[PDB]
Amino acid sequence: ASKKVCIVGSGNWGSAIAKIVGGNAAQLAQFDPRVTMWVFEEDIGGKKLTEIINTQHENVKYLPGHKLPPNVVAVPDVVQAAEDADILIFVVPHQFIGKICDQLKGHLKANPTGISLIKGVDEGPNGLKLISEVIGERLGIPMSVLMGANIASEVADEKFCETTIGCKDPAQGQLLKELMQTPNFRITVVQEVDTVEICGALKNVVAVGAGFCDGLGFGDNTKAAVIRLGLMEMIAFAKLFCSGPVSSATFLESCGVADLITTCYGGRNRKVAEAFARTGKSIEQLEKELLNGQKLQGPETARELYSILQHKGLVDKFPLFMAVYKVCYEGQPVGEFIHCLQNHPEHM
Amino acid sequence: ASKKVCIVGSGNWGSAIAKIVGGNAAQLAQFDPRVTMWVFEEDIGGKKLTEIINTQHENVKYLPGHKLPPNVVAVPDVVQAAEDADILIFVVPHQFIGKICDQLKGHLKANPTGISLIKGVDEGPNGLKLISEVIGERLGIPMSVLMGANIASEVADEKFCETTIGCKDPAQGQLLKELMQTPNFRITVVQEVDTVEICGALKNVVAVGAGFCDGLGFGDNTKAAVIRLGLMEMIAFAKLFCSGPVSSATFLESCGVADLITTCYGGRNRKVAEAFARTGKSIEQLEKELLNGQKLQGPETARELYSILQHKGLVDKFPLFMAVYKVCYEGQPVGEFIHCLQNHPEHM
Numbered sequence A, B: 001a002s003k004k005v006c007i008v009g010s011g012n013w014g015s016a017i018a019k020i021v022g023g024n025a026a027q028l029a030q031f032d033p034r035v036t037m038w039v040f041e042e043d044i045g046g047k048k049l050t051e052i053i054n055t056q057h058e059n060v061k062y063l064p065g066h067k068l069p070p071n072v073v074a075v076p077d078v079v080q081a082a083e084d085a086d087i088l089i090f091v092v093p094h095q096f097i098g099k100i101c102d103q104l105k106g107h108l109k110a111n112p113t114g115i116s117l118i119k120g121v122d123e124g125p126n127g128l129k130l131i132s133e134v135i136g137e138r139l140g141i142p143m144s145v146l147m148g149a150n151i152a153s154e155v156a157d158e159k160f161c162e163t164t165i166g167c168k169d170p171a172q173g174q175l176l177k178e179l180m181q182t183p184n185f186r187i188t189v190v191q192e193v194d195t196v197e198i199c200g201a202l203k204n205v206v207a208v209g210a211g212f213c214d215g216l217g218f219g220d221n222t223k224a225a226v227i228r229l230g231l232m233e234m235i236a237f238a239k240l241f242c243s244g245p246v247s248s249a250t251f252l253e254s255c256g257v258a259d260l261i262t263t264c265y266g267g268r269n270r271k272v273a274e275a276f277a278r279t280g281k282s283i284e285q286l287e288k289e290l291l292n293g294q295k296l297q298g299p300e301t302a303r304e305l306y307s308i309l310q311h312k313g314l315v316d317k318f319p320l321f322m323a324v325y326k327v328c329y330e331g332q333p334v335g336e337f338i339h340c341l342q343n344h345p346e347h348m
Ligand SMILES: NC(=O)c1ccc[n+]([C@@H]2O[C@H](COP(=O)([O-])OP(=O)(O)OC[C@H]3O[C@@H](n4cnc5c(N)ncnc54)[C@H](O)[C@@H]3O)[C@@H](O)[C@H]2O)c1
Pocket: A009, A010, A011, A012, A013, A014, A015, A039, A040, A062, A091, A092, A093, A094, A096, A117, A118, A119, A120, A150, A151, A152, A153, A293, A294, A295, A296, A297
């Protein structure tokens, strides 16, 4: 029997993914052509967004200049969207996944599996807690993740790129790959799930600082350095707080070095972080003023890093991460950022 | 006794290095204030360049909008400029190093040392042969290297960046760091010379490829993957052709990931690579029409990797490098570049 797929989420990335998943489900036999997409209902000029999506087959508010495959159906109730799904792609802003596992808990199919595209980290009474873990625990289903240099707008334009899928079960990995891959969306399945997922979360903090540096008037040599030092801390962080095995070779996958690069140069975090350096407005305000409803995962992830590090009394071990955190939330002048670069340890 | 320094070269990078070396030499006791710089004489409208430099204290033709420290003296005869030097900074386009060397052979001080900033590779009977090695053997002097994300224009504008110094001798490493370091030019000394030098050489080949993709109309996700797949081939190439230990860590130094990033975004090879993808003019002609005298090291380096690989019969082992080489010299359509990424192996 063909597998039913449900896309929980519908934003910039969620909509781009819909195009890829919609296209594959329709052309592939192993996947049910009917693909549901949970859409947090919104009123746009009196019309309901779900209505507009199923009528015009496009979510222009979040993914401009693109159509969505007709077979992707917008469903306002999450339970109804996931009810009969065999595979659930979790792709919503970090701050809402919690409540969504709410309603979903206990209303899923027997052997339903899931894959997460959410970038960020959670905290557990005992160390760091991956979003994928939290979701897999609450919903009780096998989890995988997809992480890579995939700025939505470029993906929706079908511009060549790659991504990394973290899945322990080979059979499932080859499965998710057949569902996600495209002649221009090349995937590499990997087993070190945790490392691949933390690369996605942590790279956004680095990108906020990169953004700060642009707002300070610096160029490529500097952004390269911020990227380079942040990578030093990312690997240091993963090897410290991640359960079991953590290899550096994993950071050389799309989820590490490549995602770090494309994000520091063209991600939403870089843009806002640059404006923050210039205007002095709040991360929140700029978020609302510049992203037309899309969510930043950068700042809040830094905030989470802070909490995770202090509960271990190790706040002084990650200068760059904490410098990003302090400028965003503590009021530290952006003009002192360079300083964390000038005194950053040579190795960690 | 202070050490006299001689800068062999006066180009884009040579001139910036002169500012940095000129400044520290004047400010630090261990270095003689008189800094000689060999300048390949040029007739700039009836005036000798060396005369312009020593009078106007600027080499605008190669480093626009900047002055050079008065203590940096332009010397037209390389033997005269290097004669009394204790430290020699080799920084000239790859194509001119060989001739300069046999001119210097037997004319250096007994215990003279040298550091090479030249990016490229040569070929010896059986395989690879590093430029620094060729210089050391021909001039019979100990060698070091300086390699990092260092776009000259930015280094000259005093914008924060880092660089890597590859030196086997600790004492000599610290000394070179004192002569080269700046509050905005941060140095890390490592002993893996060979790997550091191979990174500078190889990354330009990747940058030519990045420029191609820009010329094909692609964005950041594609450039990121280009850099990522390029790194994969770099490490695999270094581990296979370099003498002695080649650690993957070394690539996380400025000379590796960083320079890879900055070059692919604001380097001369990228600029020309793009113009080549658009106009169809020869690289040589573009080099002349766009860099007002400056020299690209990327295309010739690819031409060299081809020679090396074709002598080991491994031309088929490095798709990306050889794709860069083929588009540059065989007439392979540039549009066919993405094809070497789509079919690129996942691991090497
Ligand atoms: N934007 C990208 O290019 C990109 C690329 C790779 C991964 N991602 C990741 O994808 C995840 C999803 O982000 P995204 O880009 O699809 O969205 P957005 O950040 O593009 O959009 C905000 C979305 O949140 C929803 N929303 C707003 N208020 C809500 C509420 N109160 N409750 C529930 N939902 C609400 C809206 O329905 C809208 O779809 C993120 O974790 C991010 O890291 C994004």
